[PDB]
């Protein structure tokens, strides 16, 4: 049960420079006031990130997924709900399904016969128009239920959530970080580390991913999210006396 949201006009994507985002904890270890060199997947400094806007506007296109994807969203009222990961997305192969609502985090791994536009019609949940078939399910994850602010708060973006997706040897790793910001549309000039969220032994392959946002026409709040790609680079993490990464340096940026 779904309705196609074809009521969108095609616009080119804008580019922005990621100033200092993309640093996280490579491994669970405590180091006090040392400078450690680590080579792993990272987001290059001053990289071209894609700007997507959702208003009038409903942008849910399919994007390639290779060597992980870094996701950031300057959001108010929490329009963004979740993501899906898979290689076919037509019930032929198991597809990762991630949805966050006001109730709880839900994770499913089944051959979901995904539609063109997976979404949740909304303030309360009314239409779970994301998938149709759940026949061959391997893993299910549910956290502790809670309540989330579903009210449509207006104004400039107050919360900035940064998420990193990466797959190593079948294991699915997700990192989360939230920081309050006060700007118009760009990333703040500052530094912050992304603590690990949870590790999943899904053991399935992923090639592309999709974001999630009477039957025709809708008005949504103005929310902008950035999407970026990771490639193997070497960094020099600078640990503090308390165990928090305070600074980082990209080796391949400039000769200095």
């Amino acid at each position: 049960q779904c309705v196609n949201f074809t009521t969108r006009t095609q616009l080119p994507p804008a580019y922005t420079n990621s100033f200092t985002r993309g640093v996280y904890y490579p491994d669970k270890v405590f180091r006090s006031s040392v400078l450690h060199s680590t080579q792993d997947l990272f987001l290059p400094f001053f990289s071209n990130v894609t700007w997507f806007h959702a208003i009038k506007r409903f942008d849910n296109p399919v994007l390639p997924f290779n060597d992980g994807v870094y996701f950031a969203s300057t959001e108010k009222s929490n329009i963004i709900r979740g993501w899906i990961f898979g290689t076919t997305l037509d019930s032929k192969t198991q597809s990762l399904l991630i949805v966050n609502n006001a109730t709880n985090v839900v994770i499913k791994v089944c051959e979901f016969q995904f539609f063109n536009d997976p979404f949740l019609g909304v303030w309360m949940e009314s239409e779970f128009r994301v998938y149709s078939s759940a026949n061959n399910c391997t893993f299910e994850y549910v956290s502790q239920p809670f309540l989330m602010d579903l009210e449509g708060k207006q104004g400039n973006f107050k919360n900035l959530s940064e998420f990193v997706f990466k797959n190593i040897d079948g294991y699915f790793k997700i990192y989360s970080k939230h920081t309050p910001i006060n700007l118009v549309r760009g990333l703040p000039q500052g530094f912050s580390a992304l603590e690990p969220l949870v590790d999943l032994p899904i053991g399935i392959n992923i090639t592309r991913f999709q974001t999630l946002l009477s039957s025709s026409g809708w008005t949504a709040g103005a929310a902008a999210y950035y999407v970026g790609y990771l490639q193997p680079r070497t960094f020099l993490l600078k640990y503090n006396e308390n165990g928090t990464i305070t600074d980082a340096v990209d080796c391949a940026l400039d000769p200095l």
Partner: peptide, 19 residues
């Protein structure tokens, strides 16, 4: 010493376990 909630190991400059 005070770790982080997710941190497990403790290491020194010489790259060996001490916590």
């Amino acid at each position: 010493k005070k770790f982080l909630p997710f941190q497990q190991f403790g290491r020194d400059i010489a790259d060996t376990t001490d916590a």
